[PDB]
Amino acid sequence: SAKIVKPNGEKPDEFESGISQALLELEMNSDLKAQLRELNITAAKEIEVGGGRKAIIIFVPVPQLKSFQKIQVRLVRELEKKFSGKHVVFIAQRRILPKPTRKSRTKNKQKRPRSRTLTAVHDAILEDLVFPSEIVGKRIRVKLDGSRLIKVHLDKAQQNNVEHKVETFSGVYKKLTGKDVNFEFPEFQL
């Protein structure tokens, strides 16, 4: 559809509806339909950067996330021109849980999986933003003010795929987590 392809996220909203309409339209069009197979989102959002530019966010149901990773570049290329003047990235949405060891009340409902934990989700989110580099290293530094800056060593191949997205990816993570990240390319590759 074009309005009920965003459940659990509130179906009316102007910008989000205007994305969905022309999105599913491309998938229905015969121009590409041999790798597009009528998937749907669950929400969307637009978030800026201090670079003075906007960038769009696409959420997915997450078992469907795997299929998006198949095409991921051709699709994003076409929608980079179709929605132009903004950057385009996929991401996934999880139903993160408070601890039973206590941040909200437990009833002995279930164990709480450690993939449904908080910290594992914030690691998994980073894996998708810079998916085509396939993160080589992670390092962290701690400041005298108790802040933290998270270095990410990326592969030294597939550089220009991410090099004009390099700053705009960092602003995404800020809005989702509350944390500051930097992206680097290392001295050497093994």
Partner 1 sequence: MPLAKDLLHPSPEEEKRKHKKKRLVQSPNSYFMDVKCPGCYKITTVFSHAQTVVLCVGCSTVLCQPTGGKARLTEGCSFRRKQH
Partner 2 sequence: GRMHAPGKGLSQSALPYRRSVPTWLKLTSDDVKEQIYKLAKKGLTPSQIGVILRDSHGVAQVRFVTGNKILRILKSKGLAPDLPEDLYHLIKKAVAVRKHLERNRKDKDAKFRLILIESRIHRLARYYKTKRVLPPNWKYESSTASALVA
Partner 3 sequence: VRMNVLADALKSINNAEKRGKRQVLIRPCSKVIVRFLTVMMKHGYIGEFEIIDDHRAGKIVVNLTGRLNKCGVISPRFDVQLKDLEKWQNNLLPSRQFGFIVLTTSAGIMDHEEARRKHTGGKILGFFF
What is the C-alpha to C-alpha distance for residues 149 and 139, in angstroms, rounded to an integer? 9
Among 81, 105, 143, 164, binds RNA (CB under 7 A): 105
End-to-end C-alpha distance for the chain, whole angstroms: 47
107 vs 164 by CB, closer to RNA: 107
Among 98, 139, 163, 180, binds RNA (CB under 7 A): 98
189 vs 101, 133, 136, CA distance in Å? 42, 12, 9
> Which helix (H) or strand (E) covers residue 44, if one does?
strand 44-48
Strand order in the sheet with 87-90: 44-48, 54-58, 87-90
82 vs 138 by CB, closer to partner 1: 138
115 vs 160 by CB, closer to partner 3: 115
> Which helix (H) or strand (E) covers residue 57, if one does?
strand 54-58
Rounded least distance, CB 87 to RNA, Å: 21
Query: Is residue 34 part of the contact set for partner 3 (CB under 8 A)?
Result: no
* Residue 134 touches which member of partner 2, RNA, partner 1, none, C-beta under 5-8 Å by kind: partner 2
* Residue 187 touches which member of RNA, partner 2, partner 1, none, C-beta under 5-8 Å by kind: partner 1
* Residue 139 touches which member of partner 2, partner 3, RNA, none, C-beta under 5-8 Å by kind: partner 3
Length in residues, the chain? 190
Among 119, 143, 188, 190, binds RNA (CB under 7 A): 119
What are the tokens at 91?
């991401």
Rounded least distance, CB 130 to partner 3, Å: 16
Rounded least distance, CB 134 to partner 1, Å: 11
Among 32, 137, 156, 158, binds partner 1 (CB under 8 A): 137
70 contacts: CB under 8 Å, gap ≥ 6: 35
What is the C-alpha to C-alpha distance for residues 4 and 16, in angstroms, rounded to an integer? 11
Backbone dihedral angles phi then psi of residue 132, each to the nearest 5 degrees: -65, -10
For partner 1, the binding residues (CB under 8 A) are 137, 187-188, 190
For partner 3, the binding residues (CB under 8 A) are 137-144, 146
